[PDB]
Amino acid sequence: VNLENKTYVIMGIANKRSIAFGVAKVLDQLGAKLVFTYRKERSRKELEKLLEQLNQPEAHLYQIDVQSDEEVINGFEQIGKDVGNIDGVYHSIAFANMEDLRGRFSETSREGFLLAQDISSYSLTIVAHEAKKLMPEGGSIVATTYLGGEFAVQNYNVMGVAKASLEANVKYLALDLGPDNIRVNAISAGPIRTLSAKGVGGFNTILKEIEERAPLKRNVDQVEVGKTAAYLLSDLSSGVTGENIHVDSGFHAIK
Amino acid sequence: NLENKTYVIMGIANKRSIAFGVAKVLDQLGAKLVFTYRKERSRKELEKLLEQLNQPEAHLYQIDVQSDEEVINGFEQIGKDVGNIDGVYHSIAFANMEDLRGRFSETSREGFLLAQDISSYSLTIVAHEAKKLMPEGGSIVATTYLGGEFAVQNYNVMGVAKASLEANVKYLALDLGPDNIRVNAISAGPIRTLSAKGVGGFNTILKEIEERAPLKRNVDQVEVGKTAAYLLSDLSSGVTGENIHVDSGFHAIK
Amino acid sequence: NLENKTYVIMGIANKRSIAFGVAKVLDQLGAKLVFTYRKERSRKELEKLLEQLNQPEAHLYQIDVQSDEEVINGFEQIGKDVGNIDGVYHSIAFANMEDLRGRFSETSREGFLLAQDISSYSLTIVAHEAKKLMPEGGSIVATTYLGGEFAVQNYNVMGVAKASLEANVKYLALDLGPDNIRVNAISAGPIRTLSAKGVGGFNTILKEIEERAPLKRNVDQVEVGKTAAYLLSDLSSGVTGENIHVDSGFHAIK
Amino acid sequence: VNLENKTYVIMGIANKRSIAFGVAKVLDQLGAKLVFTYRKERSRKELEKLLEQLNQPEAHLYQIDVQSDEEVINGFEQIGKDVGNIDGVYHSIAFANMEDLRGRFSETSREGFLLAQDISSYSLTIVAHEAKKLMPEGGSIVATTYLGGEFAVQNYNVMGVAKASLEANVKYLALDLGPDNIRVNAISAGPIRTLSAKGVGGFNTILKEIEERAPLKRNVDQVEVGKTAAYLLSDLSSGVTGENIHVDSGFHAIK
Ligand SMILES: NC(=O)c1ccc[n+]([C@@H]2O[C@H](COP(=O)([O-])OP(=O)(O)OC[C@H]3O[C@@H](n4cnc5c(N)ncnc54)[C@H](OP(=O)(O)O)[C@@H]3O)[C@@H](O)[C@H]2O)c1
Ligand SMILES: NC(=O)c1ccc[n+]([C@@H]2O[C@H](COP(=O)([O-])OP(=O)(O)OC[C@H]3O[C@@H](n4cnc5c(N)ncnc54)[C@H](OP(=O)(O)O)[C@@H]3O)[C@@H](O)[C@H]2O)c1
Ligand SMILES: NC(=O)c1ccc[n+]([C@@H]2O[C@H](COP(=O)([O-])OP(=O)(O)OC[C@H]3O[C@@H](n4cnc5c(N)ncnc54)[C@H](OP(=O)(O)O)[C@@H]3O)[C@@H](O)[C@H]2O)c1
Ligand SMILES: NC(=O)c1ccc[n+]([C@@H]2O[C@H](COP(=O)([O-])OP(=O)(O)OC[C@H]3O[C@@H](n4cnc5c(N)ncnc54)[C@H](OP(=O)(O)O)[C@@H]3O)[C@@H](O)[C@H]2O)c1
Ligand SMILES: C=CCc1ccc(Oc2ccccc2)c(O)c1
Ligand SMILES: C=CCc1ccc(Oc2ccccc2)c(O)c1
Ligand SMILES: C=CCc1ccc(Oc2ccccc2)c(O)c1
Ligand SMILES: C=CCc1ccc(Oc2ccccc2)c(O)c1
Ligand SMILES: N[C@@H](CCC(=O)O)C(=O)O
Ligand SMILES: N[C@@H](CCC(=O)O)C(=O)O
Ligand SMILES: N[C@@H](CCC(=O)O)C(=O)O
Ligand SMILES: N[C@@H](CCC(=O)O)C(=O)O
């Protein structure tokens, strides 16, 4: 898995704990050139501090709020103009309101339901469409999902239906972009303490149950997600598309 | 036997509607039926289709599931007109036609969100409001297609709306189970309907079923209805969060 | 209503057997029932349990599904005694005690193969022999457990037999589909039975259902039997190669 | 991925077209020590001739018929004495009579049904048990499966039920061996012209459906399976266990 002369766009770093920063460290250690997108200026500030730990000689940073068609379209356009064609995209982006991540799913508001779909699922579709322009010879797109997309997990509520939606998006993108030699896959990460995890009720309980019940008896971390991202984004996974790899200590496989 | 049961059926548009299939079966079983429709078309249409049924009266309510207020006032009214209900059959979905062909990667934000709104979110607010009419418990069934589980050619934005609906069912099963409300899905095989006309290559889809599915025949709306009757009754008391394929066994082969 | 239908129920040992839940329901719905058994002790219990049913006749056949001869000759006798049948409920599994606890990696070859033979192969041969008595189609249902789909502590060799059983249902559905013979499974939640005493930590499993499953209660044998009635009847005519969870929604959560 | 100082056992090479030989070539490229097990004398012969294509400085060949406990037990024990501890096992073994394979599935004989389970599924359990003794600090076990284990595929018949058994075996082994840090996983390969494929009815029409329908619109090869094996057998896939990775051009994702 040597990645020199490969370029990947990593979307969704907010701070040192981000799953996307685990990917960035692994890709960067494997010699890839990296392009980062962020939403909040605070995330750019963190990226600028975090880039100090990476071997990248150039900070390539773009503000892309995936709610904006304009900003995805012009951001990727700009990316191509600055770094030329790319090899793949790591999508690590999701959002829901706090109100909708605890108590009763049946009480989800329409606006909070469509908000989570728009940011956490649709964003992959329009990103794939725009990123495909920069991959005339093929490439690899990987999104980050959670087991809550496949089963009802307590408290995960609106996010789970948005992850179900994301995991299908991956399948439909895989079929549609296959003839272009663009692979599309998801990683299903086990619970990891991030800024977003703070919004999920019951999160400490979830971690504990993994240590008690998952086959490896331990939690996974961000670098483990990254190592599997390196596989998915690289030629090691030629042949693999429409797939969902659980990086979760085995927990998906047990009841 | 469904005498003294009452079910709300959402999404009859014409004689070919899957929901009319459900209707004829529940009616044949002695249930009292309430209907909800979106446009006045499906109303005059329902007025005439209701003459086939043995319903001694016409409980019709206009509900566009795109409006919270309509879903709310609608179910409140049903509650005043008929009292507590035993279940809801959801048979409602939509996507713009240009989204149901060519390249899924070219889907608009607006069309993606519209399909989610009508085809998946609708079940959540329907269930919240229907719950109010089921203090003793009850049964909610939605209609999905195999396209929510696998990428199918042309089905596109609706495949992601279905994947969403299927998890919606799971999360509603978990939330509503302590209230004794079961929530399930029927994954219907391909049936020629009004909406079925809007999917690219629907005929190639019907023919594949005959050639390849275990029963080597297509299903009809009555078979969906027979399985709705099971899920909506005490025959399925132990069963919730489930997805039952009424598709001649297509789901189980490759 | 199942009057003028005939079903063979395989695997009643006592009043707690899942298959006796199936028998009660089907008997209540007016079916003629034929029973098969392995141990003497099980025929005795069967004779006693019949007094609670409305069967005018005791139709009882010893069939140890480890023997081809017994299955072939059992089904042939059944056809001579009662004629053509409408389906078969299979409620048979076995593994050695030390293979339902501890470490799966230490399973013996003879134990693994024993569990496959009785718990999965037996369906294939029963289907072949039963097909002969279903010239116009019918319905076959096997009983499975979520441990065939996931690794469950202590279920061990039986988990692998159930995974084999669940595929056997799909391959049989595809094979026998063109003969209008449907094949399905019910994945039952945990229920206190004689066999359940072989599974390490059973009580803990039961408590986990009550605490975590959507319905927050365990299921019983009659709930299994109600879903069997649906699968074994024309209500489910469109449905084959399917696995219906009767487990209070436990399969749908994590 | 770099695999110097790692040792793997590869079971089930018969000739140049065997899936397991694609595994061998990839791992050998990555610097692994490889140890090879075979059943038929003809397979040891092909092995000896195929070894010349490889960088292995040393033939390590062991006859093991997985029908025999003794041969599995003694085989792994001798491997231990010859090479030391190992880092994992690639399992590429299956078998079923022609005479059951070209029946209506409902006509499968008891002895052929159990033969296929014995060789194609049970053998993994016993291999894992014996190989565990050579993995005190952990390691990784990979087995080869096919989509016909998850769905009823025309003609695949008794082997579909065996693959279903194998895929559960993987899960139960993952759970049992997890606390010892041994990961167990499966690769679900797409159709590949092998000696074994020559017993599946209508193999050619299966091949061509892939090209017409699979998102990548093309068939896979042995080397693509090997690259995914290298991933599964290496530290890249820490956190992954009880997983089934489809290497099949995305075919598993479509209907
Ligand atoms: N932590 C876990 O246990 C876990 C497990 C499985 C899956 N996941 C998934 O992992 C992914 C990354 O999350 P994380 O856990 O690493 O948390 P995180 O560090 O908070 O990252 C989430 C990212 O989403 C971005 N984002 C939200 N809305 C956006 C928008 N409109 N446009 C652009 N970016 C937007 C955030 O950017 P800003 O902060 O700049 O707004 C942030 O960088 C998510 O898809 C999540 O669902 C997490
Ligand atoms: N036909 C198939 O092969 C098939 C297979 C699997 C699943 N399904 C599912 O079955 C369900 C019914 O489809 P069908 O084939 O029976 O087509 P149909 O007869 O055209 O029914 C579609 C129904 O959805 C209603 N609807 C659309 N948007 C609505 C809205 N905003 N508010 C309220 N109602 C709305 C339509 O109402 P108006 O016309 O009054 O607007 C119509 O009654 C859908 O969920 C569909 O996805 C169909
Ligand atoms: N109870 C549960 O929680 C549970 C949950 C899910 C699925 N299941 C499945 O339900 C089915 C039976 O369940 P149960 O729990 O009801 O146990 P049960 O009352 O102990 O019945 C098991 C039956 O299997 C029969 N059997 C064993 N070996 C046989 C053989 N070689 N030939 C013919 N019959 C044989 C036994 O007959 P004899 O006594 O005459 O030997 C007995 O009637 C099994 O398939 C089991 O795996 C059980
Ligand atoms: N080819 C495909 O399209 C395909 C697709 C998906 C999965 N698979 C799986 O891939 C694996 C490898 O098969 P293949 O296609 O590569 O065919 P293959 O080249 O014929 O290899 C099959 C191997 O199985 C070995 N084997 C059979 N019985 C054995 C026993 N009792 N003890 C030890 N080894 C035994 C054979 O060894 P001997 O020749 O020495 O008897 C042979 O080396 C199998 O598990 C197969 O089911 C194949
Ligand atoms: C709840 C267990 C694992 C987990 C933790 C954090 C996650 O990230 C988000 C959760 C909710 C909204 C936005 C992001 C997430 O998607 C999954
Ligand atoms: C592809 C064939 C099966 C099929 C036919 C009709 C269906 O109903 C709709 C299809 C597209 C938009 C709205 C509803 C539907 O969801 C599935
Ligand atoms: C593990 C809890 C559910 C459960 C309980 C009992 C079961 O029946 C048998 C269990 C082991 C051997 C034979 C039958 C069974 O298959 C499943
Ligand atoms: C059916 C298409 C793919 C395929 C081909 C060859 C396979 O290997 C064997 C198939 C049958 C018996 C032994 C091995 C195999 O397991 C799968
Ligand atoms: N139950 C507390 C703690 C949850 C957590 O661990 O994040 C909450 O709802 O915030
Ligand atoms: N832990 C108990 C469980 C037995 C049971 O409940 O079946 C034991 O091993 O006996
Ligand atoms: N036992 C049912 C089978 C139903 C079916 O084959 O559709 C019958 O009476 O035929
Ligand atoms: N269908 C042909 C070809 C089989 C094959 O390609 O393996 C046959 O029955 O042998």
PDB file of N, CA and C and ligand atoms in Angstrom, chain C residues 100-101 154 192 195-204, ligand 10:
ATOM      1  N   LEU C 100     -22.779 -26.639  23.334  1.00  0.00           N
ATOM      2  CA  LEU C 100     -23.615 -25.457  23.602  1.00  0.00           C
ATOM      3  C   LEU C 100     -23.125 -24.567  24.758  1.00  0.00           C
ATOM      4  N   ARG C 101     -21.801 -24.524  24.918  1.00  0.00           N
ATOM      5  CA  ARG C 101     -21.151 -23.775  25.994  1.00  0.00           C
ATOM      6  C   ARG C 101     -19.657 -23.697  25.707  1.00  0.00           C
ATOM      7  N   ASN C 154     -22.252 -19.016  23.527  1.00  0.00           N
ATOM      8  CA  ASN C 154     -22.712 -20.364  23.892  1.00  0.00           C
ATOM      9  C   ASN C 154     -23.514 -21.133  22.877  1.00  0.00           C
ATOM     10  N   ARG C 192     -38.419 -21.216  26.867  1.00  0.00           N
ATOM     11  CA  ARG C 192     -38.103 -22.376  27.687  1.00  0.00           C
ATOM     12  C   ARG C 192     -38.674 -23.686  27.144  1.00  0.00           C
ATOM     13  N   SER C 195     -34.942 -28.647  24.921  1.00  0.00           N
ATOM     14  CA  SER C 195     -33.725 -28.323  24.179  1.00  0.00           C
ATOM     15  C   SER C 195     -32.980 -27.091  24.685  1.00  0.00           C
ATOM     16  N   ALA C 196     -33.725 -26.037  24.981  1.00  0.00           N
ATOM     17  CA  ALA C 196     -33.136 -24.865  25.573  1.00  0.00           C
ATOM     18  C   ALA C 196     -32.271 -25.135  26.800  1.00  0.00           C
ATOM     19  N   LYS C 197     -32.506 -26.207  27.566  1.00  0.00           N
ATOM     20  CA  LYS C 197     -31.642 -26.570  28.691  1.00  0.00           C
ATOM     21  C   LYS C 197     -30.206 -26.958  28.301  1.00  0.00           C
ATOM     22  N   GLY C 198     -29.963 -27.163  27.015  1.00  0.00           N
ATOM     23  CA  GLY C 198     -28.623 -27.461  26.527  1.00  0.00           C
ATOM     24  C   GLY C 198     -27.781 -26.224  26.286  1.00  0.00           C
ATOM     25  N   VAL C 199     -28.417 -25.065  26.191  1.00  0.00           N
ATOM     26  CA  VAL C 199     -27.708 -23.841  25.873  1.00  0.00           C
ATOM     27  C   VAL C 199     -27.210 -23.121  27.130  1.00  0.00           C
ATOM     28  N   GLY C 200     -25.901 -23.076  27.371  1.00  0.00           N
ATOM     29  CA  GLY C 200     -25.358 -22.203  28.413  1.00  0.00           C
ATOM     30  C   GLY C 200     -25.945 -20.797  28.479  1.00  0.00           C
ATOM     31  N   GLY C 201     -26.174 -20.289  29.685  1.00  0.00           N
ATOM     32  CA  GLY C 201     -26.643 -18.926  29.892  1.00  0.00           C
ATOM     33  C   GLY C 201     -28.028 -18.564  29.396  1.00  0.00           C
ATOM     34  N   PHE C 202     -28.936 -19.542  29.337  1.00  0.00           N
ATOM     35  CA  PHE C 202     -30.238 -19.351  28.695  1.00  0.00           C
ATOM     36  C   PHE C 202     -31.024 -18.263  29.421  1.00  0.00           C
ATOM     37  N   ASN C 203     -31.086 -18.355  30.738  1.00  0.00           N
ATOM     38  CA  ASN C 203     -31.801 -17.367  31.508  1.00  0.00           C
ATOM     39  C   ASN C 203     -31.338 -15.951  31.218  1.00  0.00           C
ATOM     40  N   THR C 204     -30.031 -15.682  31.258  1.00  0.00           N
ATOM     41  CA  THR C 204     -29.506 -14.403  30.809  1.00  0.00           C
ATOM     42  C   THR C 204     -29.976 -13.964  29.437  1.00  0.00           C
TER      43      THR C 204
HETATM   44  N1  LIG E  10     -25.147 -20.784  33.142  1.00  0.00           N
HETATM   45  C1  LIG E  10     -26.102 -21.899  33.256  1.00  0.00           C
HETATM   46  C2  LIG E  10     -27.064 -21.823  32.097  1.00  0.00           C
HETATM   47  C3  LIG E  10     -27.842 -23.125  31.879  1.00  0.00           C
HETATM   48  C4  LIG E  10     -29.206 -22.789  31.234  1.00  0.00           C
HETATM   49  O1  LIG E  10     -29.806 -21.786  31.702  1.00  0.00           O
HETATM   50  O2  LIG E  10     -29.610 -23.521  30.291  1.00  0.00           O
HETATM   51  C5  LIG E  10     -25.440 -23.255  33.088  1.00  0.00           C
HETATM   52  O3  LIG E  10     -24.391 -23.289  32.394  1.00  0.00           O
HETATM   53  O4  LIG E  10     -26.087 -24.232  33.548  1.00  0.00           O
END
